[PDB]
Every structure is written in C-alpha cells, then in structure tokens.
Amino acid sequence: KVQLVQSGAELKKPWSSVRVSCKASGGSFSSYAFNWVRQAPGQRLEWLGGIVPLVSSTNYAQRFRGRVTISADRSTSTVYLEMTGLTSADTAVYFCAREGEGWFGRPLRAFEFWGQGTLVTVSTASTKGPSVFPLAPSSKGTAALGCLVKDYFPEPVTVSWNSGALTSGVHTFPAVLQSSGLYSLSSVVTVPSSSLGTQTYICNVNHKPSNTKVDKKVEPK
Amino acid sequence: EIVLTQSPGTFALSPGERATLSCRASQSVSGGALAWYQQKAGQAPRLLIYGTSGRATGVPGRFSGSGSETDFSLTISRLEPEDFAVYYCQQYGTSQSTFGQGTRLETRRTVAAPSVFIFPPSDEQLKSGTASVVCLLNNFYPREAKVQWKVDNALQSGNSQESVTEQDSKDSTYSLSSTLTLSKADYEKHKVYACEVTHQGLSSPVTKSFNRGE
Secondary structure, three states: OOEEEEOOOEEEOOOOOEEEEEEEEOOOOOOOOEEEEEEOOOOOEEEEEEEEOOOOEEEEOHHHOOOEEEEEEOOOOEEEEEEOOOOHHHOEEEEEEEEEEOHHHOEEEEEEEEOOOEEEEEOOOOOEOOEEEEEOOOOOOEEEEEEEEEEEEOOOOEEEEHHHOEOOOEEEOOOEEOOOOOEEEEEEEEEEHHHHOOOOEEEEEEEHHHOEEEEEEEOOO | OOOEEEEOOEEEEOOOOOEEEEEEEOOOOOOOOEEEEEEOOOOOOEEEEEOOOEEOOOOOOOEEEEEEOOEEEEEEOOOOHHHOOEEEEEEEOOOOEEEOOOEEEEEOOOOEOOEEEEEOOOHHHHOOOEEEEEEEEEEEEOOOEEEEEEEOOOEOOOOEEEEEOOOOOOOOOEEEEEEEEEEHHHHHHOOEEEEEEEEOOOOOOEEEEEEOOO
C-alpha cells in the first residue's frame, strides 16, 4: 500500500519561508507525479504544483510561480515544498497527493494517494497557551456543562472529557478566530441532571504548541 | 483559467436515494480530463472518479461519472450512510488544474428544535478583566438558526461570534455555540443577559436569560 507521511505543522511569521516534506512508502516513487494541494479553512482546494522525481520534471501553477519550489529526493523517496513571501492568506492545510496507478501502473493524473496534511499558519501573533474557564451547568431532565478554551495560538487544541471515558453527548465546537490574533472554542456535554452530584466531570485541554496540559474540573454554580 | 462551479451548494437527501451533483466549466474541458473526490471532515480527499467516467481502485460501483465539454455529473445510484460528505470536481487541463467549490451532501431527518442553554462568565474569568457569555443550541435540524443577544433588552451587533459543529453521524443534527464578549466593566454595568433563538422547529422564539450575580 502506498503511504504518504508529511512533516509536522508549522507556524511562520509573514514574509518568511516554509518547507514541508512528504515521505512516500510502499509503491514506486520516482516514476509518478507528486503534487501539493492546499486547502484554506472553509475554502476550496487549490493546486500549487507537482514534480515527477525520475526526471525532476516540475510543474507549477501560475498563481504561485516564483513563490513555490517543489523538489524530490529519490534516495529517501521524499518530496519537498518550499514557499516564500508568506502572508496570512497562505494559512492553510497543505496536502501532498500522488497520482493513481491504473492498468499495470499506468499513471492516472488524478490524485489517488494523499498525505495527512500539514497545517501552515502565517501570523505575527505569538504562541500562547489557552485559559480554560468552566461553563457551569444551570441550577435547573438533562443538564449541559462544558469548558471554554479561550485566547490560545496557534491551532490546534484537543479536548477530551473525563480523560476519554465520557464521549456520548460531547460537542467540541470548531474554534473561531477572535478580533485579536487568538483562537477560542467551547466544548460542551449534556449529562443526566441526577448525576451532577455523584459524577465528576473534568475537561482535559491539550495545546501542544505551548506545552500546555490543563485539566479543569466543572462543578455546578 | 477554467473555473469549475458545482451545484447545488448543499444537498439534503436520505440513504437509499439517488444523488446527482453537477459541475460546470467556464470553457471546454479537454479530452475527458475530469476528476471527482470525496472528503469527510478532518480527513484528506478520496479519489472517486478519474477521467470523467473512470472509477478509481476500490471505489464502489454505485459511484458513476458522466458528462462532457462544459457539463459533468457525479451520480450515486443508492445512497448509503457513509456516502454523506463533501464532493469536489477537478479539471486537469495542461500546466494548470483547478477545483470546484464543492457540494455538501447532508443526511435528511425530521425537523428538530434546539435545546437552548446559557452560561454566564465564570468568576475565574471575571478575575481576569473580560467576560464571555455563552449560548448553546444543542442538537437541532435544519442547520439554519438565528441567535440574538440582549443586554438589558438591547440587541447587540458585532460583539458576538458563533460556530456550528458538523452534522452528527448518529442523529444527523447540528449544534451552535455563540459567545458574547464584553469588558468586565461593561458586564458589571448591566443586569439582564439573554440569548434569543429562532429556528424552524420553534413556533415562538426561545429566550434563555439570567441576571448578573445570582
């Protein structure tokens, strides 16, 4: 099976550069075209370019000509993307996609095999850990509680409940970009009103960019 | 440049029905060089159709691709629960390749009214100089809903941000979170804080309110 493993997520300042890798495993590497497709949050897919490693045949999109350089290391079966002149418009998830194998390995142009994606964030905002505030259940069926993860940068944060033991009825909302450069999301969960006195509800927030692990115990008002 | 435009924007169908998604090009697409991808939230796209009509390896037979020139279509003959996702078309021209904006296939279900909850800003947050009031709209359908904030019965504008979850893979519902941000002074200024929800499943708007410091 053909596997594509990309580099880790990155946070770059504007007008700097980013370098994303893509290691290929399994099938043949040198004779197929590896491409880079980026997807901005909530927007459509955008093809940047590609390369065929055997002849180092590169091919870029006109929107990124002179800004994007795609190379390949045949000895390690790795494909690299390097972009300069970064701005906030370049904040997106960058995928590395290889074209498909047809009859007897006939290349298929269409991108059949994909990597996991690499989040590249371009912003002047500094890395900050989140503040976790309890969304305490009402004094009043079913009761809803949760945690507010506010003022962190960059993405992502991971929210579990009771260290993963509580999964049913949980809703971790997509984060929004505040008026400042910081993110904020909320993670709620609906539980029986009778269990509020005998069941402990703890929200586990992890923001690895700041090495921040926070367990916040939510209790009624 | 070729611009791909997909239709419709969002489709609401039930499993076992036939789905037809259209993709129109701004000019003639070269010799049947059209692709169709499926994408589920949090994952990478999955190639469904290559070259207008070619079925990708492992893709089920219920997916079919058709069309020519400037009009193409992806047809799912009998919808199954795992087929509800976002679908993209792509043109592979020459030295350039573009995508469509995408069509989202959602599971259709009975109208569901939202369960509305309101959370005041915690004392631990108020000890930091800001106040975040939260309004939760849990499990509703369809996606369209309206949230209005009122501070001492005064409609707000600009100081509130909301976010909606993906469609739940079990009950096919949505959930909305609205956050109203105020200064600590502006929070201690007034008394009543309410969030009013308007939704198709509600004959009358549902207002969830609270008084400061009680």
